[PDB]
Amino acid sequence: GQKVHPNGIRLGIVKPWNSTWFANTKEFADNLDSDFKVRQYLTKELAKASVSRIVIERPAKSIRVTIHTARPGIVIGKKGEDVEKLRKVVADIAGVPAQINIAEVRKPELDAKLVADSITSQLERRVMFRRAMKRAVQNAMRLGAKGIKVEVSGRLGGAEIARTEWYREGRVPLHTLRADIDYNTSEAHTTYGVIGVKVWIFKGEI
Amino acid sequence: NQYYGTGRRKSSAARVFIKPGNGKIVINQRSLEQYFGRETARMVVRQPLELVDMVEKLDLYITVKGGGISGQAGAIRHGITRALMEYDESLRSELRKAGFVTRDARQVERKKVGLRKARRRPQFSKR
Amino acid sequence: RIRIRLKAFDHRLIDQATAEIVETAKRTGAQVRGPIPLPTRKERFTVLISPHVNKDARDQYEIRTHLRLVDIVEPTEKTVDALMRLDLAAGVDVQISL
Amino acid sequence: RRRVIGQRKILPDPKFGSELLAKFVNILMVDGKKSTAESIVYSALETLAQRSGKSELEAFEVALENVRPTVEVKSRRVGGSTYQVPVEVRPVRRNALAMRWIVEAARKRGDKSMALRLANELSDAAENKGTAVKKREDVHRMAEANKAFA
Amino acid sequence: QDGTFDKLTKKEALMRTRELEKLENSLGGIKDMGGLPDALFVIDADHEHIAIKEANNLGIPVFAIVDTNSDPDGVDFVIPGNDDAIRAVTLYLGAVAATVREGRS
Amino acid sequence: AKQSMKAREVKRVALADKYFAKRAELKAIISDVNDRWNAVLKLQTLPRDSSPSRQRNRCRQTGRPHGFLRKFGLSRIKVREAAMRGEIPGLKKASW
RNA sequence: UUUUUUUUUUUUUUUUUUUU
RNA sequence: CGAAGAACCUUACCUGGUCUUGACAUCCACGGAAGUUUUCAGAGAUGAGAAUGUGCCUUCGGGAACCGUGAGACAGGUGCUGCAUGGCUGUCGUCAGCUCGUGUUGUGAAAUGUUGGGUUAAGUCCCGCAACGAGCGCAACCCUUAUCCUUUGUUGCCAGCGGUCCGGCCGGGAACUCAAAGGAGACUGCCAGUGAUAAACUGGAGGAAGGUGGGGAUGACGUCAAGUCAUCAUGGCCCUUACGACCAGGGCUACACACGUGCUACAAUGGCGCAUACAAAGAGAAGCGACCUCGCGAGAGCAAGCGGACCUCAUAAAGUGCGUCGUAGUCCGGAUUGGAGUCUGCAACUCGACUCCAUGAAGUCGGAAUCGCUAGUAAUCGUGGAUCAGAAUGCCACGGUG
């Protein structure tokens, strides 16, 4: 009956930031404003292998962009011509340069997010994804974790249908600010209305 | 050589020294009876020194920064308790046996939401 | 009595900075003051970082924000000059202004 | 309620060493202001003394003898209906109750100033004539009598 | 087996010295249990109670010294005798305890 | 009255010196009760629209005037974010 | 196993679909 | 009430004057340098004129600051349902919580440890009982104390002397308040009584608290099918010639009725007239302002200062010493009404808010029966703040004779 972030409340304790930067008194507004826009652009570039962690550092307002994706080799490009492009279009909004750094998602099966991006991809096939939903969780759980609970709310049937389903492939200590746990999301549609999946990945105890 | 004390009661904000002999009680530049002349509380400020024969052996000098005579009458009590505590270890027993050693710290588990007393827990003879 | 009102976010940084003056601005003139504090802002800090609208994720921090008077009894150039040469130590806000 | 923490300790009076005189004026207050009211009650013990020119403080007890009660009646319904049943007020409640009866007469009692109400009312008490004696004696005509109906 | 059980706070460690007091007195003859029992040797039927029920549910061998209140059909082995006190059990046990090691061969 | 008179204030707010408070520094001295020239004030009072000190104001961080807290530079409805980014430095557990 | 401290208080309308 | 300003006011609403891409904001099409100053009209929106101006790159290209008219796309509003849901808050709650990963007596709504003996104020603690233990409440991190410990000396701040031209004045040094950062010390500790030398409860060694020492605080599941539906955050659904946005007016208060919330007036445990002893809680450059000039005063002027003990707004009211009434509707009652004035304003008058002198409506201790308020707590005894071009008696928080 509660949804409860383990993440965000505990930045220094095994759960690092989505952004760590410093603006004084007057200079905060356009930084923050750009912090939605460069994020917007990056994820629609990355979606061909998603983005697990989207890490906006700002060493001097100018932006040390640090992007965890499953396949770097497609945003590197045929070697360097999309790394030019990105660094242009993420500096442009900010008015200041943006140093596009990659990282590789170290096996998508174990991740802070990519368990939700696997299940929400299936809703683009439009057929009965249920055949593949418990499966695609249990696969990723043979390659990592100790428990996971998964929730789907959305338009998942026909004509006027909106209902919500819940599933438990292991136990979940719900908040514990010491544990290795991750909370996260991802969002789909199916020509009728939203399908928004959420996760609690009890990876390990401490 | 000399001794000292300080207090914080209702809301004084006063000190005291002790000097070697002749038995008086001044407040910067006037005597006790001039500063407290009708305040029914005037009697206590010298009372545990007169015991131990102050007249040729101790002498007293009070100064002030929040006048406040109805609090000062006891702020001086814990103050002169301090002064004595280095002159004579023996009177720790006296000062304690007559209360002069105490200072203001106690409410009795009072009102926070509406119930008069609020620490004492729900209570029975088997339930 | 010209009051150089040294401050920092942390105790560690203002400590290093006052300790240079109480010695070096003292060299041939004043008994220069520096440890003497002000209403040091030991409060609690709350910014939202909730990844959606769900329970809390407003991670509460603590601060020092520690502040002191450096005091110089006379402007006497042949003793103070090291504090004006200390300009390079940008991280401490000095508020000399009086 | 299990703890023995109950009542008010205070210090005695500034002249003669009694909790009696302290508590007496520490009911008479009617608005707080303590110190000058303690000075008026001192003048009350002097305006008593003008009746003889001796130690009339020796007669403050003698008067209060006719005004200390035994009984009080409290809220009691324990046999399906009003059933009093006085029971005694304790040894320390004896003259503390008498102050209330002296004060509740004094408030309006008509004499020449604030001291001369309490001087005369404790004169009357000495002679058994007192308003405070009559306020006592009415709860003796009432409660102390229903000791034969309990 | 070392001294590290005494860490943290002495009351956080005496919380477990009470756990010792309540567990070694109740499980001290079975501190390992890496696999299930294979046979049950037993001297009561109504206090011990549960033991004969668990055994019979699982079809386990049972060796049981018993009296005139019994139900012999719930044991593989009745041994007819005085149910209680140290004199009666001690007649049987110095053979039982020998055999369960000298028969190993 | 939502975006409103902003278009009318913006064209004359910045000149409240030229309309009065520096144009006054000779002729307005005589013109006072303390100085009694009765002829004069009544022929400086004509600008009506700029006529300072008057400013309808611009609450900026709220798109419309659901009031404006002059102690704080924000709208009357706006307080709750300051527990979630610190813009009111005494916003803590309530005094009731 | 004596158990009358007054007798009464209008209809509604809550009610998160569904096979499992 | 929302409304913390229903007479420019965040506009209801009564209207009239404009509109329905409207006030605000884009992507291309052809083009423009951006603004200062009065005069007459007009209730405001808006209308009719007269003068004065011409910026930065500079590929003379493309445009910037920055203003246009013309295209196609195209703009919006507290409208409540708790019932798609998440934050958040509450009075219940400082109960020591429930129900579960497995098990299994109950098919299932029974809780299944609450059972059987005893023991504590206490699910207190010895066990037992077919019951585990799993972790989120637990174990407690906290803030302010309060007493101090070092380093300190702060506009602070003065032990003991140095000058006094009598003001910590300025020499002059480090006891302590103060200011305060790092932090620290009280435990059944040892003494008597208690009983099972359990329990814990009393007094006390010793204390700045004592058996949570106090005061703030967090406020778990469970929280009424209660909210925050008027910033929430958003799923299902609004009206759109419309619930969309520009702008001048005004009138909410009447008066029979109550009924109360909030105010008081009924005189000496009162005040009245002259004179005397001590605190501070606060807010403070859309700032706060002394000394000092003119004063019957609301209220004018001069202006040092003062950014956080320096400037200022308190010179709390009580109380105390000497005089005056003599129980007297007054000397006290501001109900109020004769005139006189003001700080702003388009604005207060059929609409206020306060001032100076004349006065003086109910007044003399009211019954029944709506709950204040147990402690350092309600009589009693004050000062501040925001909304906001602004007058709340609302409320809001700590001091103190008591």
PDB file of C-alpha atoms in Angstrom, chain B residues 12 21 26 35 38 41 45 47 55 61 66 68 70 77 82 87 90 93-94:
ATOM      1  CA  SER B  12      19.520  37.790  36.881  1.00  0.00           C
ATOM      2  CA  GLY B  21      37.420  39.618  56.460  1.00  0.00           C
ATOM      3  CA  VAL B  26      27.607  45.524  49.007  1.00  0.00           C
ATOM      4  CA  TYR B  35      19.003  47.531  46.990  1.00  0.00           C
ATOM      5  CA  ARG B  38      11.194  46.164  51.270  1.00  0.00           C
ATOM      6  CA  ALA B  41      13.157  37.940  49.997  1.00  0.00           C
ATOM      7  CA  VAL B  45      21.727  36.405  50.278  1.00  0.00           C
ATOM      8  CA  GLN B  47      22.471  33.459  55.439  1.00  0.00           C
ATOM      9  CA  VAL B  55      32.115  39.012  60.740  1.00  0.00           C
ATOM     10  CA  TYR B  61      30.585  42.199  46.958  1.00  0.00           C
ATOM     11  CA  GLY B  66      19.833  42.195  34.850  1.00  0.00           C
ATOM     12  CA  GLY B  68      15.479  41.652  38.573  1.00  0.00           C
ATOM     13  CA  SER B  70      12.639  38.612  42.689  1.00  0.00           C
ATOM     14  CA  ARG B  77      22.230  31.352  46.254  1.00  0.00           C
ATOM     15  CA  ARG B  82      30.134  28.166  44.181  1.00  0.00           C
ATOM     16  CA  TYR B  87      36.822  27.989  50.655  1.00  0.00           C
ATOM     17  CA  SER B  90      32.917  20.517  54.736  1.00  0.00           C
ATOM     18  CA  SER B  93      26.958  18.618  53.457  1.00  0.00           C
ATOM     19  CA  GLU B  94      25.428  21.805  55.032  1.00  0.00           C
TER      20      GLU B  94
END
